[PDB]
C-alpha cells in the first residue's frame, strides 16, 4: 500500500493519505549510486496546506507541488524544514518562488548556510532547548535534542495522532545506522526517549525514509543506534 522505493522513478512524487487532512509525500533520490526513498508531510490548515520538508531536490520539489495541486488542489502557504540536510531543504528555493513562506529553526538556517544548502527564509523561535515545543498551525513542533543531527525537529499532528519523526527515526527495515556523519550518537537515545515521553499517544509514526509504523519505531531506532555506537 505505502509507496516503496521501487515504485517511484527519480523525479516523481507520490502522496499517501494517512487521515483526514494529513498526507505523507514520498520521493526517491540517487546517492552514491543507490536509490533511497524519502518522506515528508502535508497537513491541511483550513483551506491552505502546511508542508513539512522538501522532496529532496529542486526537480522533485517542483513535482511535489504539481502532485499536491493534482490530488489535493489547495495552496501550500507555509513550509517547515526539520533539519539542514538536502532531503529537507533541497527545493526551498522552488517553494519560495511559488510563494510559499519557508521556515526553519535558527540552528537549521545556520547549519544550512555553513553547508551550502538552501536556507529557509523565516525563523522558528522557541525551539532551541531540548524538550521545547511550539504550536505551528495544525501541528506541534518539538525539538527532542540532538540525534540524527543537532537541529532535527519532529512534528506531531494532534488531530490525527500522527508523529513525523524525520530522519531521527528509522524504519524497521533499516537495521544498520548507515551514514551518521552529523549525528550525536551519545545523545540520540535520550532524544528518542524525550519523543516517547512527549507523544506517548502517537498512533502513526513516519520515519524520514521508508515505511511508517507505530511507536515501536522509536525503540527500533534506539536499538540500531546503540548497536552502531558499539561497532
Ligand atoms: C548524514 C546522514 O546521516 O545521512 C544518512 C541519512 N539518514 N537519514 N537520512 C539520510 C540521508 N542519506 S540516505 O540516502 O537517505 C541513507 C539511508 C540509509 C543509510 C544511509 C544513508
Ligand atoms: Cl510570510
Ligand atoms: Cl515570505
Ligand atoms: O538526511
Ligand atoms: Zn539528514
Ligand atoms: Zn514571509
Ligand atoms: Zn534523511
Chain position carrying cell 511535489: 64
| SS3 (DSSP) at 192 | helix
Beta strand 133-136 with 48-52: parallel, antiparallel or unpaired?
unpaired
Which residue is listed with cell 507555509? 78
What is the resolution of the experimental data for this entry, in Å? 1.5
**For residue 172, what is its C-alpha cell?**
524497521
> How many whole angstroms separate alpha carbon 49 and alpha carbon 72?
9
Ligand 1 atom at minimal distance to the Cα of residue 32: 14
| Nearest Cα residue to 50 out of 25, 27, 70 | 25
User: Structure solved using which method?
Assistant: X-ray
Strand ranges (E), 55-161: 76-80, 101-104, 122-123, 133-136, 139-142, 154-157
d(CA 154, ligand 5 centre) in Å: 13
| Cα 29–chain centre separation | 15
Distance 88 CA to ligand 7 centre (A): 7
Which are the contacts of 183, defined by CB distance < 8 A and separation ≥ 6? 146, 147, 148, 149, 177
Whole-angstrom Cα distance, residue 50 to residue 35? Answer: 27
Q: What is the DSSP string of 8-40?
A: S-TT-EEEEEEETTEEEEEEEEEETTEEEEEEE
How many other CB atoms are there within 10 angstroms of residue 132's CB atom?
16
User: Using a 6 Å cutoff on CB, does residue 87 contact ligand 1?
Assistant: yes
User: Are 218 and 171 contacting, i.e. CB atoms less than 8 angstroms apart?
Assistant: no
Burial class for 58, CB neighbours closer than 10 Å (0-12, 13-18, 19+): middle
Residue 109's domain comprises 1-231
Query: What is the C-alpha to C-alpha distance for residues 191 and 129, in angstroms, rounded to an integer?
Result: 11
Dig out the grid coordinates for 202 from the structure.
502517537
Residue 17 grid cell: 493519505
If one counts the domains in the chain, the total is 1
Centroid of ligand 1 to alpha carbon of 179 (angstroms): 5
Ligand that comes closest to the CA of residue 179: 1
Give me the residues near ligand 3 (ion), CB cutoff below 5 Å.
101
- Alpha-carbon distance values, 7 to 1, 10, 11, 57, 63 (Å): 11, 10, 12, 18, 16
Residues in the chain: 231
Amino acid at each position: 500500500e505505502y509507496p516503496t522505493v521501487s515504485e517511484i522513478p527519480v523525479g516523481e512524487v507520490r502522496l499517501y493519505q494517512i487521515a483526514d487532512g494529513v498526507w505523507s509525500h514520498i520521493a526517491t533520490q540517487s546517492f552514491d549510486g543507490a536509490v533511497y526513498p524519502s518522506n515528508g508531510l502535508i497537513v491541511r490548515d483550513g483551506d491552505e496546506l502546511l508542508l513539512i520538508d522538501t522532496a529532496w531536490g529542486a526537480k522533485n520539489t517542483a513535482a511535489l507541488l504539481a502532485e499536491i495541486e493534482k490530488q489535493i488542489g489547495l495552496p501550500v502557504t507555509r513550509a517547515v524544514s526539520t533539519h539542514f540536510h538536502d532531503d529537507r531543504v533541497g527545493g526551498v528555493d522552488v517553494l519560495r518562488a511559488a510563494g510559499v513562506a519557508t521556515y526553519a529553526s535558527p540552528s537549521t538556517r545556520r547549519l544550512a548556510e555553513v553547508e551550502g544548502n538552501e536556507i529557509p527564509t523565516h525563523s522558528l523561535e522557541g525551539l532551541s532547548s531540548s524538550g521545547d515545543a511550539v504550536r505551528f498551525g495544525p501541528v506541534e513542533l518539538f525539538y527532542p535534542g540532538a540525534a540524527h543531527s543537532t537541529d532535527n525537529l519532529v512534528v506531531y499532528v494532534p488531530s490525527a495522532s500522527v508523529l513525523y519523526g524525520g530522519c531521527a527515526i528509522y524504519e524497521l527495515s533499516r537495521t544498520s545506522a548507515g551514514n551518521v556523519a552529523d549525528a550525536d550518537l551519545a545523545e540520540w537515545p535520550t532524544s528518542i526517549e524525550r519523543i516517547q515521553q512527549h507523544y506517548p499517544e502517537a498512533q502513526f509514526v513516519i520515519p524520514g525514509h521508508g515505511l511508517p509504523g507505530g511507536l515501536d519505531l522509536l525503540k527500533h531506532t534506539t536499538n540500531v543506534v546503540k548497536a552502531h555506537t558499539n561497532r
